[PDB]
Write a protein that binds this ligand. Structure first.
Ligand SMILES: C[C@@H]1O[C@H](O)[C@@H](O)[C@H](O)[C@@H]1O
Ligand SMILES: C[C@@H]1O[C@H](O)[C@@H](O)[C@H](O)[C@@H]1O
Lengths: 310, 310
């Protein structure tokens, strides 16, 4: 079965690490951090890795039940919630995943909405929703143990023992104390514990090459900043690769970024077996190109192939 | 002739095309008196997008634009006038042959979500976000005219002339005065004006058949209720069909809902050319079936094909 990519343009793609549209292509050659995100991880022959699952609605989502309001040193009203798998089944910590699929894969204060639909009940359940923040760096962020903590501005109107959904919206803050670092993984089982079953780190191996990211700008609840989330492949590529399961005929696919209005190749890239892109670029920042561009699979090459400079 | 295919995503791997929600169940309602003419999640089998349908899961019921004016409500809450652009940021052209900007909500109700802003000017821009409600039945909901109104509990902290995003989360209410009706279209240009360029209504033509929906339950900000949103096809089908653009070889594709664990067919359905499903079922409610089940295209049939009763 021949390898293929979706023919979706950049303006028709969404981020695999946060529910956002892809805004720009982006490089940062001098990135010192180890790049090892856990969402949007999929091999070219369709093997999902890390915490990656298929739903755009599942990315950085949680499902579970509030247990109790809890004390926390930090501002706001805090709540413990047990988390299940996103499909409602119990999370089994013995499964070989880092955390429930969909769990956020970066450090920061993730802003969103907690909503509840009560179990009990014209035989219709009571509901409530409020803004909420999940600090993924918190010692109480233990999704691998089956529970996390969120904070609200709302002081009271959150119910214990009721089905609870977290819908992510953005970040609460990117100030110094909010610890936003998109390449720092949460400690999924809590402070001082080793993460396990991780998707592997990614890096360029060839000289002059750097990672190419699909970048989205993420909303902020307040403060100054223009934060972004970089994913290795968009969610639609994850969905496509997963379904096709085409054999990878080498370690590296040659892809061309093409303008379909002109038919011209804007640049070429290496699409690696583990599911990430590299380019021959010597600068950091956005790739300035029309958002009607798309990557076209041209052929299987090898690690020794030299890319045309961008 | 390029063969017609459906994605091999299971029910637990599909998302709603009319609101950013996972698919929860398949659902019928034979006695539905309303005309079914939703405008999101509309796509022909040969890949023609219709109504307000666009490809991004993040675009469904989303808005982008700028706030122009604050108006206080006579009783409670603050209202904000917003000019809307296309989701890709370009000016919305009301002379284009669409009902409204793509992604525009296609039902009557109070849609609850978060309005977020990132200022243009500054050396980092200021941000804010607040819970917001868009009443799509309001005389002020005129997205086809390039402007809508949203309300906030927040009384002051929304900025004029700054890039504004609406992230949908659920419904504010489903009480009588909140006018939720998933099959009542908004008046995209206001009450006395006719909606234009609509995707056509859908219905079974043969007796004993009824529409089959992909149903998702939608969160509530408050009050009692268990509201749901029914779409004709999941967003992943829209994306798939759009890319494949396989010729339709008849008016009806016969599809089988199959259990991959046993390989057995649970039921069959008609997938109609205009992009909707019917089944031979004489009852209302969910279809009790495993969520690892999926629809498999078997053959092109004819409108007179008699479905096996469910
Ligand atoms: C930078 C400031 O952050 C705050 O949270 C906001 O409420 C203000 O409007 C402003 O954007
Ligand atoms: C396949 C590779 O071709 C390169 O040119 C050589 O330098 C390597 O040793 C290797 O043989």
């Amino acid at each position: 079965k021949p390898f293929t990519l979706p023919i979706l343009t950049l303006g028709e793609l969404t981020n695999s690490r946060f529910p956002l549209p892809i805004d720009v292509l982006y490089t940062n050659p001098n990135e010192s951090a180890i790049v090892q995100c856990q969402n949007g991880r999929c091999t070219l022959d369709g093997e999902l890795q890390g915490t990656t699952q298929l739903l755009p609605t599942g990315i950085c989502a949680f499902r579970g039940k509030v247990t109790q309001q809890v004390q926390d040193e930090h501002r706001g009203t805090h709540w413990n919630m047990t988390v299940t798998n996103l499909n409602g089944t119990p999370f089994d910590p013995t499964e070989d995943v880092p955390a429930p699929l969909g769990t956020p894969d970066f450090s920061g204060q993730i802003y969103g909405v907690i909503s509840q639909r009560n179990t009990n009940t014209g035989n219709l359940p009571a509901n409530r929703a409020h803004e909420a923040v999940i600090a993924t760096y918190s010692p109480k962020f233990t999704p691998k143990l089956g529970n996390i903590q969120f904070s609200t501005w709302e002081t009271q109107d959150v119910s214990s023992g009721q089905p609870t959904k977290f819908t992510p919206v953005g970040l609460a803050s990117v100030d110094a104390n909010s610890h936003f670092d998109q390449w720092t993984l949460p400690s999924y089982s809590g402070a001082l514990t080793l993460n396990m079953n991780l998707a592997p780190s990614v890096a360029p191996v060839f000289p002059g090459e750097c990672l190419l990211f699909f970048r989205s700008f993420i909303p902020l609840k307040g403060g100054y900043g223009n934060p972004a989330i970089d994913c290795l492949m968009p969610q639609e590529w994850v969905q496509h690769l997963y379904q096709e399961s085409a054999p990878s005929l080498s370690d590296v696919a040659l892809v061309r970024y093409v303008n379909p209005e002109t038919g011209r190749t804007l640049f070429e890239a290496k699409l690696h077996r583990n599911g990430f892109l590299t380019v021959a670029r010597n600068s950091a920042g956005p790739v300035v190109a029309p958002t009607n561009g798309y990557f076209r699979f041209d052929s299987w090459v090898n690690q020794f192939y030299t890319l045309a400079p961008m």
